[PDB]
Amino acid sequence: ENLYFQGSHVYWDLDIQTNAVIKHRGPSEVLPPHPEVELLRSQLILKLRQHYRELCQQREGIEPPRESFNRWMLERKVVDKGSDPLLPSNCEPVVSPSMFREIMNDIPIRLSRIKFREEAKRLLFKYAEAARRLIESRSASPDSRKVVKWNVEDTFSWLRKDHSASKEDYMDRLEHLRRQCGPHVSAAAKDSVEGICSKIYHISLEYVKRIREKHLAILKENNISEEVEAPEVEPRLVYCYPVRLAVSAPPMPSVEMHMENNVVCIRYKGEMVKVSRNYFSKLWLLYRYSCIDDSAFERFLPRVWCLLRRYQMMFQGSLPVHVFEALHRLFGVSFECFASPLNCYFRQYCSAFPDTDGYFGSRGPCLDFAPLSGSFEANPPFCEELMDAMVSHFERLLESSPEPLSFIVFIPEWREPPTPALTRMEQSRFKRHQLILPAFEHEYRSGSQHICKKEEMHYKAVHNTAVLFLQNDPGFAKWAPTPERLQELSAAYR
């Protein structure tokens, strides 16, 4: 036992070749990444984040619900017909159902759970006060304006009379008051919450154009134009390959790098990104396996800076190494539908950003990827608009291909009201098996595994995980979830 260094464990197998087959596709129209543009992109995300918390606070008196902005960017990107890889640009509808739903949940007050009797009375009073107030200062039909304006008295009077109530009595009347006020308050605040969702979208649209105009200025500065080289393709079915970019990449600015106790630090204009040593070596292997426009690999370091800076602006967990080995050995899995250069196990996968990740093996976004054959694993981020689109996307692929096709989907049952995404997959005619990993009895890998130490790598899953095998007939013939194969798969979790 003599590790190369302290964090020299390996969480990937970049030797597995793909079995994903696509029709050969032309290059993506996304512009190649440049540190100057990523630097502007990062400071525009921060401003957009600050705009968002300013709007929630001075138009609803609340802070933004945790991670709602991140969840907003995923939802917008499912429907975004725009061009920016990170920011929404051209969406319908303008108002995001995701952001609207989450802001509405914390109205008129973000509900915290209760730890005392006086604390329950505390929260109950605050809700009744904020519910009555919102109706008074914002327009409402004098019915529902007073359907609640009384229900707030009735709980107010009950608080003054019944000095014998308990902690349960208060929490019960919160929900009771919540049901009477919910429809009434939501209808009243519908205009303001939509205004927040719409303003954030339009500010994003404005930042997109600022990013593109700075980008096109750099391209014209380096004598590069936005044209189509040769879309004349011999139509054919090929094994998959990383997503390519149409416009040629310019020369990259100089970038400084130094390692400090097995942590690689990369700086551009004083802006530093970090990545642990073994993961820095992994990006090297991915870059060598995937990049074809960088002879002598002279743009590796600046493209690593853009990659780490990109995922820094952005912000699930990965499956254990021994679970991926079983999926590949038992079901031929060679490809991840939702991953990143930093957490991917195979050297072929789908990720959000084709401009920064394609150089490192990404096939681009999963929805823009139409495989005709292959055995896939899917661990999507929690976003019901993305998960719903994913199920429709997979089913279209399984419908329209005679080649063996298989999708093994991992969905944490975080909600006791199950998302229709999971419900749709349960009723899918391609479902060959459904498996439940018990809560507190299976592990995940940390989402920040690219800088976190070995001791912080693995955590036990606190919820159940549903594992569904979506396979067409040839895919089921080749990678069937037999009893003996399901035996060895669960053994990889114990």
Short mmCIF file of N, CA, C and O in Angstrom, two decimals, residues 393-435:
data_model
loop_
_atom_site.label_atom_id
_atom_site.label_comp_id
_atom_site.label_asym_id
_atom_site.label_seq_id
_atom_site.Cartn_x
_atom_site.Cartn_y
_atom_site.Cartn_z
N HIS A 393 -37.92 12.00 -24.97
CA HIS A 393 -36.77 11.85 -25.85
C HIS A 393 -36.34 10.39 -25.96
O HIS A 393 -36.12 9.89 -27.06
N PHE A 394 -36.23 9.70 -24.82
CA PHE A 394 -35.84 8.30 -24.84
C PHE A 394 -36.87 7.45 -25.58
O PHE A 394 -36.50 6.57 -26.37
N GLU A 395 -38.16 7.70 -25.33
CA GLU A 395 -39.19 6.87 -25.94
C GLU A 395 -39.22 7.04 -27.46
O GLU A 395 -39.38 6.06 -28.19
N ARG A 396 -39.05 8.27 -27.94
CA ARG A 396 -38.90 8.49 -29.38
C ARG A 396 -37.76 7.66 -29.94
O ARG A 396 -37.89 7.04 -31.01
N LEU A 397 -36.62 7.62 -29.24
CA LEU A 397 -35.47 6.87 -29.71
C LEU A 397 -35.74 5.37 -29.69
O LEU A 397 -35.36 4.65 -30.62
N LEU A 398 -36.39 4.88 -28.64
CA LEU A 398 -36.68 3.45 -28.56
C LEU A 398 -37.77 3.04 -29.55
O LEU A 398 -37.78 1.89 -30.02
N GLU A 399 -38.68 3.96 -29.89
CA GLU A 399 -39.72 3.66 -30.87
C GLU A 399 -39.12 3.42 -32.25
O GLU A 399 -39.50 2.47 -32.94
N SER A 400 -38.20 4.29 -32.67
CA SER A 400 -37.85 4.46 -34.07
C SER A 400 -36.50 3.86 -34.45
O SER A 400 -35.84 4.34 -35.37
N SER A 401 -36.08 2.80 -33.75
CA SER A 401 -34.81 2.16 -34.08
C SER A 401 -34.92 0.65 -33.93
O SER A 401 -35.34 0.15 -32.87
N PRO A 402 -34.56 -0.11 -34.97
CA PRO A 402 -34.47 -1.57 -34.83
C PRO A 402 -33.17 -2.04 -34.20
O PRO A 402 -33.01 -3.25 -33.97
N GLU A 403 -32.23 -1.14 -33.94
CA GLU A 403 -30.95 -1.50 -33.36
C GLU A 403 -31.08 -1.60 -31.84
O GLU A 403 -31.94 -0.95 -31.24
N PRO A 404 -30.24 -2.42 -31.20
CA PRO A 404 -30.35 -2.58 -29.74
C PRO A 404 -30.10 -1.26 -29.01
O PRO A 404 -29.08 -0.61 -29.21
N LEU A 405 -31.06 -0.89 -28.16
CA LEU A 405 -31.03 0.39 -27.47
C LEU A 405 -31.51 0.18 -26.05
O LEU A 405 -32.50 -0.52 -25.82
N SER A 406 -30.82 0.79 -25.09
CA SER A 406 -31.12 0.55 -23.68
C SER A 406 -30.77 1.78 -22.86
O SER A 406 -29.70 2.36 -23.02
N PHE A 407 -31.69 2.17 -21.97
CA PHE A 407 -31.49 3.30 -21.07
C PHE A 407 -31.80 2.84 -19.65
O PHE A 407 -32.94 2.48 -19.35
N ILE A 408 -30.79 2.83 -18.80
CA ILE A 408 -30.95 2.53 -17.38
C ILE A 408 -30.93 3.85 -16.62
O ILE A 408 -29.91 4.53 -16.57
N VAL A 409 -32.08 4.21 -16.05
CA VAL A 409 -32.30 5.54 -15.49
C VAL A 409 -32.35 5.45 -13.98
O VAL A 409 -33.09 4.64 -13.42
N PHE A 410 -31.55 6.29 -13.31
CA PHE A 410 -31.53 6.40 -11.86
C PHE A 410 -32.26 7.68 -11.47
O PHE A 410 -31.82 8.78 -11.83
N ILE A 411 -33.36 7.54 -10.73
CA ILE A 411 -34.14 8.68 -10.26
C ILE A 411 -34.34 8.57 -8.76
O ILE A 411 -35.01 7.64 -8.30
N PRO A 412 -33.79 9.48 -7.95
CA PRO A 412 -34.12 9.48 -6.52
C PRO A 412 -35.58 9.86 -6.31
O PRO A 412 -36.05 10.88 -6.82
N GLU A 413 -36.29 9.03 -5.54
CA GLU A 413 -37.68 9.31 -5.19
C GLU A 413 -37.75 10.34 -4.06
O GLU A 413 -38.23 10.08 -2.96
N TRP A 414 -37.23 11.53 -4.37
CA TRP A 414 -37.16 12.60 -3.37
C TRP A 414 -38.55 13.09 -2.97
O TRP A 414 -38.74 13.51 -1.82
N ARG A 415 -39.52 13.04 -3.88
CA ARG A 415 -40.87 13.50 -3.61
C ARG A 415 -41.79 12.31 -3.36
O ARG A 415 -41.76 11.33 -4.11
N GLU A 416 -42.59 12.40 -2.30
CA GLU A 416 -43.59 11.37 -2.02
C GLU A 416 -44.78 11.50 -2.97
O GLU A 416 -45.40 10.49 -3.31
N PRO A 417 -45.15 12.71 -3.39
CA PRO A 417 -45.92 12.85 -4.63
C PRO A 417 -45.00 12.69 -5.83
O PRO A 417 -44.29 13.64 -6.20
N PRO A 418 -44.97 11.51 -6.45
CA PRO A 418 -43.96 11.25 -7.47
C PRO A 418 -44.18 12.10 -8.71
O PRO A 418 -45.32 12.31 -9.15
N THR A 419 -43.08 12.60 -9.27
CA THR A 419 -43.15 13.37 -10.50
C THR A 419 -43.75 12.52 -11.61
O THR A 419 -43.53 11.30 -11.65
N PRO A 420 -44.54 13.11 -12.51
CA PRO A 420 -45.00 12.34 -13.68
C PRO A 420 -43.87 11.78 -14.51
O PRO A 420 -44.08 10.79 -15.22
N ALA A 421 -42.67 12.37 -14.42
CA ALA A 421 -41.51 11.81 -15.10
C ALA A 421 -41.27 10.37 -14.68
O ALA A 421 -41.16 9.47 -15.52
N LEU A 422 -41.19 10.13 -13.37
CA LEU A 422 -41.04 8.76 -12.88
C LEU A 422 -42.28 7.93 -13.20
O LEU A 422 -42.17 6.76 -13.57
N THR A 423 -43.46 8.53 -13.06
CA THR A 423 -44.70 7.81 -13.35
C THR A 423 -44.77 7.42 -14.82
O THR A 423 -45.21 6.31 -15.16
N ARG A 424 -44.34 8.31 -15.72
CA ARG A 424 -44.35 7.98 -17.15
C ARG A 424 -43.42 6.82 -17.45
O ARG A 424 -43.76 5.93 -18.24
N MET A 425 -42.24 6.80 -16.83
CA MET A 425 -41.30 5.71 -17.05
C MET A 425 -41.83 4.39 -16.50
O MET A 425 -41.53 3.33 -17.05
N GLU A 426 -42.62 4.44 -15.43
CA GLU A 426 -43.19 3.21 -14.88
C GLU A 426 -44.20 2.58 -15.83
O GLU A 426 -44.25 1.36 -15.97
N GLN A 427 -45.00 3.41 -16.50
CA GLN A 427 -45.99 2.92 -17.46
C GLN A 427 -45.42 2.73 -18.86
O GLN A 427 -46.15 2.30 -19.75
N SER A 428 -44.14 3.04 -19.07
CA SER A 428 -43.56 2.91 -20.40
C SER A 428 -43.58 1.45 -20.85
O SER A 428 -43.28 0.54 -20.08
N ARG A 429 -43.94 1.25 -22.12
CA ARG A 429 -43.96 -0.09 -22.70
C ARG A 429 -42.57 -0.64 -22.95
O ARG A 429 -42.44 -1.81 -23.32
N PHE A 430 -41.53 0.17 -22.77
CA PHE A 430 -40.15 -0.28 -22.88
C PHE A 430 -39.54 -0.64 -21.54
O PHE A 430 -38.39 -1.08 -21.49
N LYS A 431 -40.28 -0.46 -20.45
CA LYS A 431 -39.80 -0.81 -19.12
C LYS A 431 -39.72 -2.33 -18.99
O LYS A 431 -40.74 -3.02 -19.04
N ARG A 432 -38.50 -2.85 -18.86
CA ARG A 432 -38.29 -4.28 -18.70
C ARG A 432 -38.10 -4.69 -17.24
O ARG A 432 -38.28 -5.87 -16.92
N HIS A 433 -37.73 -3.75 -16.38
CA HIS A 433 -37.60 -4.02 -14.95
C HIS A 433 -37.58 -2.69 -14.21
O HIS A 433 -37.16 -1.67 -14.75
N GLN A 434 -38.05 -2.72 -12.97
CA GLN A 434 -37.96 -1.58 -12.07
C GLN A 434 -37.36 -2.05 -10.75
O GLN A 434 -37.84 -3.02 -10.15
N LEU A 435 -36.31 -1.36 -10.31
CA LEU A 435 -35.53 -1.76 -9.15
C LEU A 435 -35.45 -0.60 -8.17
O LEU A 435 -35.33 0.56 -8.58
#
